[PDB]
Design an enzyme around this catalytic site. Structure first.
Site, PDB file in Angstrom:
ATOM      1  N   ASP A  91      -0.900   5.009  -5.902  1.00  0.00           N
ATOM      2  CA  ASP A  91      -0.359   4.044  -6.035  1.00  0.00           C
ATOM      3  C   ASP A  91       1.264   5.217  -6.177  1.00  0.00           C
ATOM      4  O   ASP A  91       1.446   5.898  -7.172  1.00  0.00           O
ATOM      5  CB  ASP A  91      -0.044   3.345  -7.231  1.00  0.00           C
TER       6      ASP A  91
ATOM      7  N   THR B 282       3.482  -3.335  -4.634  1.00  0.00           N
ATOM      8  CA  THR B 282       2.294  -2.746  -4.912  1.00  0.00           C
ATOM      9  C   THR B 282       1.026  -3.483  -4.029  1.00  0.00           C
ATOM     10  O   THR B 282       0.510  -3.369  -2.914  1.00  0.00           O
ATOM     11  CB  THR B 282       1.746  -2.987  -5.923  1.00  0.00           C
TER      12      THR B 282
ATOM     13  N   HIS C 169       7.588   5.079 -12.534  1.00  0.00           N
ATOM     14  CA  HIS C 169       8.630   4.648 -12.603  1.00  0.00           C
ATOM     15  C   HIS C 169       8.449   4.849 -14.567  1.00  0.00           C
ATOM     16  O   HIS C 169       9.759   4.731 -14.432  1.00  0.00           O
ATOM     17  CB  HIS C 169       7.529   3.371 -12.918  1.00  0.00           C
TER      18      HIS C 169
HETATM   19 ZN   LIG Z   1       2.315   0.184  -5.790  1.00  0.00          ZN
HETATM   20 ZN   LIG Z   2       5.218  -0.069  -8.980  1.00  0.00          ZN
END
Ligand SMILES: [Zn+2]
Ligand SMILES: [Zn+2]
Ligand SMILES: *[C@@H]1O[C@H](CO[C@@H]2O[C@@H](C)[C@@H](O)[C@@H](O)[C@@H]2O)[C@@H](O[C@@H]2O[C@H](CO)[C@@H](O)[C@H](O)[C@H]2NC(C)=O)[C@H](O)[C@H]1NC(C)=O
Ligand SMILES: *[C@@H]1O[C@H](CO)[C@@H](O[C@@H]2O[C@H](CO)[C@@H](O)[C@H](O)[C@H]2NC(C)=O)[C@H](O)[C@H]1NC(C)=O
Ligand SMILES: *[C@@H]1O[C@H](CO)[C@@H](O[C@@H]2O[C@H](CO)[C@@H](O)[C@H](O)[C@H]2NC(C)=O)[C@H](O)[C@H]1NC(C)=O
Ligand SMILES: *[C@@H]1O[C@H](CO)[C@@H](O)[C@H](O)[C@H]1NC(C)=O
Ligand code: NA
Length: 388
Positions: A10, A46, A174
């Protein structure tokens, strides 16, 4: 036929390997295919982007228009993990690749992949694992175990396709930001996992029978807190939350709004010029190039903010150093596409492409009939060997 393993890390920005030592990714570039960068679908979230990878459809067409399930009538907004179990969110008339493959005699699995732990038109994925509510996404020992499991699915349970999801480096990006030393240490961990993955493929005697794709959903950009001209709805003079029936704000740089009956024109004129870095649209006027707005689920008003800026609603509740969800034309949002296998050429770099074309490729790789989708197989076909 060859088996297929799609892996997603991700929030892996297209150039995360450029300022990190990535021996295993570099080797995979030598031994396989690489895209200069891959352009994700908009919104760069996402779940919507992951679903595009397994449907070949733009977000407006497959209907997963947000990480969160929401319902304008009941006012429910469910966060990312809970939404992974809302069947009606994902089963909205589009068929992901697992279901298509299983109707044609294949066996498919989902390991933590968004949309893989629900049923579609009553069918379930042959094998499926979903993580816990408080899951830890950066535990390398857990990563290696999940890869071991996935390998057993291929060999012991005669599975032909698996989609494996990792929650990093999105999580670390993040928290500390994409340019931080923490992110780079996490990219180093990813690269070690690429090597463990390829070594696990060889140990199970699948090097010549299994095609491997390593990609991601989106990139990551820094959110500067030193900046002063924040997008704050509570500081818009001629706007009131008294005109809103339903809202989706405080979630990165994308917002939605459903005004009370008859106040839509009032709200719009208030917000169209409120901030030079917030772009608000009527649903019909939202740019077509984004391939996002034209879905019944989208609200009459939606907006997005400029790179580095998040949207603050009634009160500021966002503190991430890095964010995504921005314009998919922004370089910081671009992501990776890497692949290696018997069907894949070696030492090849291709010009960028949109993620909507990955579906058609994977279907050709599995020898199955693709659902009608928004991609075109000619885009990525140069990646594959010419048969004899
Ligand atoms: Zn993502
Ligand atoms: Zn995210
Ligand atoms: C990091 O993860 C490892 C692995 O977690 C275990 O295996 C997962 C795949 C899953 O099945 C989990 O339920 C397991 O917890 C952890 O190692 C385990 O730690 C516990 C102690 O709390 C112990 O009972 C197990 O024997 C350990 N297994 C191994 C192979 O070492 C580890 O605790 C995690 N560390 C952190 C900091 O989160
Ligand atoms: C996809 O999901 C949308 C929204 O969840 C569904 O739209 C609703 O459909 C029913 C009709 O059966 C209506 O009662 C609602 O008012 C609809 N709302 C909206 C905003 O469209 C849609 O039916 C789903 N489609 C599929 C194929 O599952
Ligand atoms: C969603 O994932 C869960 C795992 O998190 C799947 O549940 C497992 O299914 C197998 C076989 O059915 C069982 O042996 C496990 O004990 C189950 N574990 C749990 C926690 O349920 C579940 O099948 C998946 N659901 C779908 C629809 O794919
Ligand atoms: C939202 O929830 C309402 C309220 O209970 C429910 O009746 C309906 O199924 C949902 N409607 C839409 C448009 O999703
Ligand atoms: Na590198």
């Amino acid at each position: 036929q060859n088996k297929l393993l799609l892996v997603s890390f991700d929030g892996f920005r297209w150039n995360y390997d450029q300022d990190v030592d990535t021996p295993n990714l570099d080797a995979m570039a030598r031994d396989g295919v690489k895209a200069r960068y891959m352009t994700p679908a908009f919104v760069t979230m996402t779940s919507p982007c992951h679903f595009t990878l397994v449907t070949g459809k733009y977000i407006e067409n497959h209907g997963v228009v947000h990480n969160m399930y929401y319902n304008t009538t009941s006012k429910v907004k469910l966060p990312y993990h809970a939404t992974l179990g809302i069947q009606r969110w994902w089963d909205n008339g589009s068929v992901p690749i697992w279901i298509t493959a299983q109707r044609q005699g294949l066996r498919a699995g989902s390991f933590f992949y968004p949309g893989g732990n629900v049923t579609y038109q009553g069918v379930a994925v042959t094998r499926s694992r979903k993580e816990g509510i408080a899951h830890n996404y950066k535990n390398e020992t857990e990563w290696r175990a999940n890869i071991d499991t996935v390998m057993a699915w291929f060999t012991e349970e005669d599975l032909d396709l698996v989609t494996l999801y990792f929650g990093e480096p999105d999580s670390t990006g993040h928290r500390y930001g994409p340019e931080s030393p923490e992110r780079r240490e996490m990219v180093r961990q990813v690269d070690r996992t690429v090597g463990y993955l390829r070594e696990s493929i060889a140990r199970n005697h699948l090097t010549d029978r299994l095609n491997l794709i390593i990609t991601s959903d989106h990139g990551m950009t820094t959110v500067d807190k030193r900046a002063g001209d924040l997008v704050e709805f509570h500081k818009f003079p001629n706007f009131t939350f008294r005109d809103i029936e339903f809202e989706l704000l405080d979630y990165g740089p994308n917002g939605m709004l459903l005004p009370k009956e008859g106040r839509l024109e009032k709200v719009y004129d208030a917000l169209k010029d409120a901030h030079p870095k917030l772009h608000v649209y009527k649903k019909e006027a939202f740019p077509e190039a984004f391939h996002y707005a034209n879905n019944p689920r989208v609200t009459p008003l939606l907006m997005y903010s400029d790179l580095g800026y998040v949207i603050h609603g009634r009160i500021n509740v966002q503190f991430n150093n890095g964010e995504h969800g921005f314009d998919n034309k922004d370089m910081d949002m671009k992501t990776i596409f890497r692949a290696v296998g018997p069907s894949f050429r070696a030492g090849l770099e291709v010009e960028p492409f949109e993620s909507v074309h990955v579906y058609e490729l994977m279907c050709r790789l599995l020898g199955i009939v693709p659902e009608a989708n928004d991609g075109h197989l000619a885009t990525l076909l140069p990646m594959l060997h010419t048969e004899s």
